[PDB]
Ligand binder design. Sequence first.
Ligand SMILES: *[C@@H]1O[C@H](CO)[C@@H](O[C@@H]2O[C@H](CO)[C@@H](O[C@@H]3O[C@H](CO)[C@@H](O)[C@H](O[C@H]4O[C@H](CO)[C@@H](O)[C@H](O)[C@@H]4O)[C@@H]3O)[C@H](O)[C@H]2NC(C)=O)[C@H](O)[C@H]1NC(C)=O
Ligand SMILES: *[C@@H]1O[C@H](CO)[C@@H](O[C@@H]2O[C@H](CO)[C@@H](O[C@@H]3O[C@H](CO)[C@@H](O)[C@H](O)[C@@H]3O)[C@H](O)[C@H]2NC(C)=O)[C@H](O)[C@H]1NC(C)=O
Ligand SMILES: *[C@@H]1O[C@H](CO)[C@@H](O[C@@H]2O[C@H](CO)[C@@H](O[C@@H]3O[C@H](CO)[C@@H](O)[C@H](O)[C@@H]3O)[C@H](O)[C@H]2NC(C)=O)[C@H](O)[C@H]1NC(C)=O
Ligand SMILES: *[C@@H]1O[C@H](CO)[C@@H](O[C@@H]2O[C@H](CO)[C@@H](O)[C@H](O)[C@H]2NC(C)=O)[C@H](O)[C@H]1NC(C)=O
Ligand SMILES: *[C@@H]1O[C@H](CO)[C@@H](O[C@@H]2O[C@H](CO)[C@@H](O)[C@H](O)[C@H]2NC(C)=O)[C@H](O)[C@H]1NC(C)=O
Ligand code: D80
Ligand code: D80
Ligand code: NAG
Ligand code: NAG
Ligand code: NAG
Ligand code: NAG
Ligand code: NAG
Ligand code: NAG
Ligand code: NAG
Ligand code: NAG
Ligand code: NAG
Ligand code: NAG
Ligand code: NAG
Lengths: 751, 754
Amino acid sequence: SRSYPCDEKKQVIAECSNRRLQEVPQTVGKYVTELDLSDNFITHITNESFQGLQNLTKINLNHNPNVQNGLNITDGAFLNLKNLRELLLEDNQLPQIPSGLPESLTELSLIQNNIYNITKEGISRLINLKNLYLAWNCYFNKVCEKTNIEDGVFETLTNLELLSLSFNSLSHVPPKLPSSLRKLFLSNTQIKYISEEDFKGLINLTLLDLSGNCPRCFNAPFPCVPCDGGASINIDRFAFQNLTQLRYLNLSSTSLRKINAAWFKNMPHLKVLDLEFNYLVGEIASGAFLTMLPRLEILDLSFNYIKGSYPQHINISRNFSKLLSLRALHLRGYVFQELREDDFQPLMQLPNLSTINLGINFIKQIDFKLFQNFSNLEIIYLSENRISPLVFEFDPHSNFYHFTRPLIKPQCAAYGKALDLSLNSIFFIGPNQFENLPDIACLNLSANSNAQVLSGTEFSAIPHVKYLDLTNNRLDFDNASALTELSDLEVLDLSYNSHYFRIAGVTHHLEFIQNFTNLKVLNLSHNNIYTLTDKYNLESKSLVELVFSGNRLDILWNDDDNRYISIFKGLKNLTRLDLSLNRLKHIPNEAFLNLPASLTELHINDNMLKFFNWTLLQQFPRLELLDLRGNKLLFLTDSLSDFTSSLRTLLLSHNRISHLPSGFLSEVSSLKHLDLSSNLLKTINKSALETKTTTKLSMLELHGNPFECTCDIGDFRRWMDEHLNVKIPRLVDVICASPGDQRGKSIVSLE
Amino acid sequence: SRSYPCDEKKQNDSVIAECSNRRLQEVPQTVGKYVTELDLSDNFITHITNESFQGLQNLTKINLNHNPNVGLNITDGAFLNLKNLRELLLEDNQLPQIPSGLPESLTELSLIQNNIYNITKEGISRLINLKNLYLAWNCYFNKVCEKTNIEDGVFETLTNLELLSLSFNSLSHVPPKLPSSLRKLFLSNTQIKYISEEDFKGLINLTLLDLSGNCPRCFNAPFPCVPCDGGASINIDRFAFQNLTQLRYLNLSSTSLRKINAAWFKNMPHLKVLDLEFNYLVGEIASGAFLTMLPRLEILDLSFNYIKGSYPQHINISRNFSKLLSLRALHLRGYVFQELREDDFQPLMQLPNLSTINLGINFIKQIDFKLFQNFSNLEIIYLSENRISPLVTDFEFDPHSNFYHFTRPLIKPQCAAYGKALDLSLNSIFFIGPNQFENLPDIACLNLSANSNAQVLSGTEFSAIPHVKYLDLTNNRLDFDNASALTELSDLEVLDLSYNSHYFRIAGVTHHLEFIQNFTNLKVLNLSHNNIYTLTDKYNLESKSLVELVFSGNRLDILWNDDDNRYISIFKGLKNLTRLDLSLNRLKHIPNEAFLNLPASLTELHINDNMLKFFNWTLLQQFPRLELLDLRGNKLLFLTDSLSDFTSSLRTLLLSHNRISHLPSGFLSEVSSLKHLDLSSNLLKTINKSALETKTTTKLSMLELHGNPFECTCDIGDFRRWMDEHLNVKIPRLVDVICASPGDQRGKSIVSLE
Ligand SMILES: *[C@@H]1O[C@H](CO)[C@@H](O[C@@H]2O[C@H](CO)[C@@H](O[C@@H]3O[C@H](CO)[C@@H](O)[C@H](O[C@H]4O[C@H](CO)[C@@H](O)[C@H](O)[C@@H]4O)[C@@H]3O)[C@H](O)[C@H]2NC(C)=O)[C@H](O)[C@H]1NC(C)=O
Ligand SMILES: *[C@@H]1O[C@H](CO)[C@@H](O[C@@H]2O[C@H](CO)[C@@H](O[C@@H]3O[C@H](CO)[C@@H](O)[C@H](O)[C@@H]3O)[C@H](O)[C@H]2NC(C)=O)[C@H](O)[C@H]1NC(C)=O
Ligand SMILES: *[C@@H]1O[C@H](CO)[C@@H](O[C@@H]2O[C@H](CO)[C@@H](O[C@@H]3O[C@H](CO)[C@@H](O)[C@H](O)[C@@H]3O)[C@H](O)[C@H]2NC(C)=O)[C@H](O)[C@H]1NC(C)=O
Ligand SMILES: *[C@@H]1O[C@H](CO)[C@@H](O[C@@H]2O[C@H](CO)[C@@H](O)[C@H](O)[C@H]2NC(C)=O)[C@H](O)[C@H]1NC(C)=O
Ligand SMILES: *[C@@H]1O[C@H](CO)[C@@H](O[C@@H]2O[C@H](CO)[C@@H](O)[C@H](O)[C@H]2NC(C)=O)[C@H](O)[C@H]1NC(C)=O
Ligand SMILES: CCCCc1nc2c(N)nc3ccccc3c2o1
Ligand SMILES: CCCCc1nc2c(N)nc3ccccc3c2o1
Ligand SMILES: *[C@@H]1O[C@H](CO)[C@@H](O)[C@H](O)[C@H]1NC(C)=O
Ligand SMILES: *[C@@H]1O[C@H](CO)[C@@H](O)[C@H](O)[C@H]1NC(C)=O
Ligand SMILES: *[C@@H]1O[C@H](CO)[C@@H](O)[C@H](O)[C@H]1NC(C)=O
Ligand SMILES: *[C@@H]1O[C@H](CO)[C@@H](O)[C@H](O)[C@H]1NC(C)=O
Ligand SMILES: *[C@@H]1O[C@H](CO)[C@@H](O)[C@H](O)[C@H]1NC(C)=O
Ligand SMILES: *[C@@H]1O[C@H](CO)[C@@H](O)[C@H](O)[C@H]1NC(C)=O
Ligand SMILES: *[C@@H]1O[C@H](CO)[C@@H](O)[C@H](O)[C@H]1NC(C)=O
Ligand SMILES: *[C@@H]1O[C@H](CO)[C@@H](O)[C@H](O)[C@H]1NC(C)=O
Ligand SMILES: *[C@@H]1O[C@H](CO)[C@@H](O)[C@H](O)[C@H]1NC(C)=O
Ligand SMILES: *[C@@H]1O[C@H](CO)[C@@H](O)[C@H](O)[C@H]1NC(C)=O
Ligand SMILES: *[C@@H]1O[C@H](CO)[C@@H](O)[C@H](O)[C@H]1NC(C)=O
């Protein structure tokens, strides 16, 4: 059995999602324990749907049906599944909690439905529930009803550890919550008041999310309903008195102006405090609560700006010096003109403060030397400011109030201390710009509209930069000594610096590249490179990877010009080369033969190639991956094994191949992965299948070929049957084009 | 009938068969006998014989350029029998020789871009009627080729020849015995180092001479370039042009000139256009005796005469520029200088007709702007690509274009049409301060594109030039945080804010587009590629005057998210709008109420290049003026069967690149207004009779169907017969209206099935 329609996988999971399925297939293996049927067109679940699949411990029916209208699940449809632990039913337009769910359930997700009634009948039998998600049923301008929570509905769920009720109209915290709760999410629930009773008994709670209740609505990116008068949430003095185990508290966008220090009296473990989108400028200056948090590691005070206010200075209370455990401080969107060394004195003896984030404050100048006086900053994040020369659209499973991606690309941060000055106005780097900074290893200058001629001295005060990002500037590469002060540079990103490269009449100089002794990775992408001055060749003894996408090799290698015929030959250590998006119609033979013999990976995808000289792979004895996707190729050589014994992956997707030559599936013993996706194949011929021996072939992609499903396809179908070790992904997309009665169906589905 | 494979055009005198770029392997035997011009360019034709055009004696013009695409073999005399052949284009055919036995009727012959190295009497000297002969670009750069041999006197018998183009061939000397009927002589890039008194002594009718690129200036060349020994100058004898009294055009670009002999111009009283780009003329520009000899000159191009590595404070223009009384345009790109002062341009200031001054690409850091007012009448002040800051076919080189510069207008004609133009694009005007625009003329057309401007415009910045009518602010970083922005510009008709994403992208900063309603005369607004998905307080765009809104490249998918009502009327307040562009907004579906709030005034609505799966046809009932609906590049499956119930205005419906697999019976019944229906690149297997059928006949004039996977069984018969009974409906590109199935038909046109 080659399984269909699902792909089976044993790290036993049937991946069956996004396959245009109309019903639960009756072709699922009986050894399957986890079934992913998300994103199909399934409209009915009955007690017949999964009979003879009782090993199932997990079912995902999210996002069904898509497109061309709700999911209809009968009473007790799942009841017979004795082992069902986890049921995901998100985005199914369910009007109610389905009835008669199995008591074995420990995890149930009903996120993004139309469920306005939470009943004993739905839920109170489900004694084994540990995590229950009912979020995003009624929010924003959706037409929906206030949520009715049957009194005591949650009381019998004495194993429940996580309950998520966010983005529903609740009005108050429900009573009779089980004391087993660890995590309680009540974001955006229209609760204006927290009483002493609401969480009095939840002694095991480690996370509480009360965000977005009484929101700050000015300039909201969503329909936002403030409390009367834009008032603050109202939280009783003793509301958190028993929450001794709280580690995470989210009070983002609760319109707070005042924080009651006493709220933290009994929270000796509190680790992450989110206070973004409030009105806390005054508390930041004078916060008594900061005195109550000596184990706090992450404090987010972002977007507490006063509307219309652009103060000279940020005002940080001396009490910040009590945050002895603080690791990250987020101060985006406070809005201020100038950062002086004195303004941050309270932060300067915190031993573990690693990250300071001052993104999006419209800061016009910074006294940079202040950063050295900190104990140990490793991320100095200043992106999106005004620093100039010195002289359903919300993911319900993510954080709603900010992105959670790293501030600094991990590959750069991995080198050491990081200074991110991206998206500023440092248009010219002058002699003292970088004076008195720490030993920066990772420097981001992307998008500073820098148009200068770097000349070998600009980075002299931080000469150990290992990863330099200069993307999206207007750099004028007119000096052979550029960047050469950076002896230890390993990664250099010059992508999107077209501005001068595109003008023929100005001089262009890339000779500095050869100076670096440790340069491993160079990205020259999207620079429109088509002409250089005097020195035509790129050279480096160390470089391993060159990204040359989005340039004009079609010009450089024009048949009437010899000058660039060795452009990459001097990159003597290169193993990875990217020549995508260079508008190539053909590569002269001599040009191809002058690519480095060291290559293991060569991409030439998304050009316009009409021919490819296969014989020339004889000069590339280490070549493992050749990527020719997105071209106009028609001809495959019929003696590939004469030209390579190294090639493992050949990517030929989105070309115009109509004929596979004799024994091509078995031509190259080393070939593991052949991608023939989206070409013009009508069949695969017997001679194409002829093998002298066996082959290393593990994966063959064929989806989007216009197959002719006559009896001519028989041979390949029988081949598929007898080579079950060759994976063919996406069989639902390996489709008959002709004739009319077969059109649209998988080739596997053919009598 | 309906012609195939070519498209025919009944033009004037002419009837033209457009037959190019059709993958043809043979000259087709199906060309109409009334055809006078045949364009076969860009096909896979390999052989021309005396049978190729047998049935086609009316042919006056044949284009065989660029054949075969992926050399062309022409038998001796293949064209001889074509008694009326006037024009033969044989460019880019890898010909090794001039074809033999060409008809004597020829008046126009192009052999541009071949491998022809011998120009013989036998090829050419019988062709007595030739008026234009093009032999350019046969041996140039690092092509493998040989020096051109021109048989002595080969051109002498061509006594009606007016244009001869020999550029981009290795010639070494001007050929002798040229016919005196010559008007235009092109000898660019021909490796001629010396011009003698004899070379053009008899060419008394010459109006153009091109000697560019002989002894070229090669520093930083964008092509393989071979200087004369020592990088010496072309050597032109004092009397080389003494008989050239009719010359209007002289191109001496890239001839390594340092010194210009005034006497060269003594007998050239009509000279109008002088190209001197890519020389070493900084010294002549400061002194230039030759400027005294050119009082009828209108265009002078001195671009890229920079001294290598030199960055002087000032440009030095001789006082002799004041003698160029007829001068209209002065091009001074690439001289390279830091500052332009008012004194530096005094010699130019009383020239009555000097309309255009071009200072592009000089790395200029400051300009004393007041100087431009003291000119008599500048209309184009071109300062693009400097350092101005706040005030305190396959061919690399198109052989049919100018090689030394682009020929496009300096200023977009739509902007220039309004009046005086100041182009400050691609500079460093990052902040517009209070006096930036002091002392300027009455600018009507203002380009500030790509100045990395990040400021909050606030209603006073353009106070000193308040009659700007066309404002280009594209590709900046503008922070639209003030409702009075640009409102000082009362007469503004066209405003381009494209590519100012920078702050629109950030949810947490405020965004304000309210200023738009203030303009009384605003007609065209372009907000493209701004990533607009959230505004502050005022969610709606309003204008009583605006006729055209370009909103492509924003996030209407977000603005019109089903859980948000706030932007449901975003465009309704554009009460005068007729053209709306919603392309590239990632839309999967448009809420019905949102669609219905688009202005009732629309005549043209584009929603192409989204991801639409649904389109509610019934809503075209509220758009009684709608003439063009463009839905190309979406994922639509369903067409309504009762389109005539919902519109009587629609003339063009563009549905290309969708997933339509069925034309409903009877789509098009009673929809009389529709002229142009584009169903190319969909998933059609056939068209049924009743799908096209109409009782009251229709205005249908164009139906596109190429790139559909047609099933060429007998099920296609009905459409084929329909095609034959509606010859007034054009179906273009019939070679691309192809059978997908079954195997024996696959690849063939549907019109080609018995
Ligand atoms: C208020 O603040 C609290 C933190 O104090 C915040 O709690 C965090 O919420 C996010 C939002 O869901 C949780 O993040 C998810 O965690 C689960 C559990 O481990 C993951 O499965 C999620 O996985 C990601 O990748 C998956 C791949 O399968 C995807 O399926 C999915 O999209 C996700 O990308 C995801 O990381 C997070 O764990 C909690 N924090 C804690 C400690 O529990 C809350 O969101 C904030 N409130 C608002 C309204 O933003
Ligand atoms: C310029 O090119 C460089 C080099 O290719 C780009 O950086 C590289 O980007 C890739 C992915 O595009 C990173 O690879 C990824 O790494 C992750 C985690 O290790 C892995 O999960 C992915 O499958 C993939 O391997 C690669 O590490 C990264 N390299 C470096 C040195 O940072 C860069 O993105 C390009 N610049 C621009 C503007 O595109
Ligand atoms: C911003 O949007 C405006 C308005 O659509 C764009 O300018 C307009 O560009 C089109 C070309 O796409 C011009 O129409 C063309 O005019 C010529 C000459 O008459 C005609 O030959 C073409 O078939 C077509 O009609 C239109 O005139 C022009 N309107 C102006 C300038 O007012 C503008 O280009 C967009 N900006 C960017 C950066 O895309
Ligand atoms: C340098 O700063 C830029 C600009 O902030 C970072 O670019 C963003 O990075 C991610 C790639 O992971 C994208 O999803 C965003 O679109 C980028 N934004 C823009 C405007 O480009 C970049 O990654 C930073 N570089 C490093 C090494 O951290
Ligand atoms: C203002 O200047 C910009 C930049 O010079 C112009 O953009 C050019 O437009 C031409 C013709 O439309 C394009 O082919 C070029 O690619 C553009 N150049 C660049 C760098 O983008 C724009 O046309 C000018 N605006 C006006 C009104 O003339
Ligand atoms: C018209 C430009 C001639 C050659 C040239 N290339 C450059 C170049 N790339 N940068 C320059 C910066 C300042 C001054 C002159 C520059 C220059 O000159
Ligand atoms: C954190 C952003 C808060 C709201 C805001 N939007 C903008 C905005 N768009 N521009 C600003 C310019 C200067 C100072 C504050 C600005 C501002 O503040
Ligand atoms: C700082 O971090 C280190 C471990 O990463 C730790 O041992 C020490 O306890 C922390 N200091 C404080 C003051 O919390
Ligand atoms: C690069 O710049 C430095 C001055 O910054 C200069 O000394 C050196 O000559 C420059 N290199 C070249 C080739 O001009
Ligand atoms: C850069 O490399 C070149 C040539 O290899 C050498 O002449 C130059 O001095 C080098 N300079 C530095 C600072 O690395
Ligand atoms: C070549 O690359 C390898 C892997 O990065 C590295 O070990 C070696 O140091 C490089 N060689 C040279 C000569 O720099
Ligand atoms: C492939 O390469 C060499 C030239 O280096 C040549 O001998 C062989 O004919 C080539 N194939 C094609 C189609 O050019
Ligand atoms: C073509 O030329 C040859 C003379 O070589 C003659 O035999 C033949 O009939 C000619 N064909 C036509 C169609 O004129
Ligand atoms: C200036 O141009 C006008 C209009 O073309 C023309 O009549 C006049 O002769 C020109 N003046 C000079 C000095 O050439
Ligand atoms: C716009 O900016 C100007 C600065 O001149 C300021 O006076 C005005 O109040 C601002 N208007 C708004 C609505 O912010
Ligand atoms: C702009 O538009 C509205 C017109 O209703 C008005 O309130 C506002 O004051 C106008 N502003 C200026 C600066 O003209
Ligand atoms: C409506 O647009 C046209 C431009 O075609 C103009 O004549 C008319 O004046 C505009 N109406 C108003 C009220 O601005
Ligand atoms: C189209 O919108 C119309 C308004 O005429 C509404 O009656 C109809 O329900 C719509 N169809 C769909 C599928 O939304």
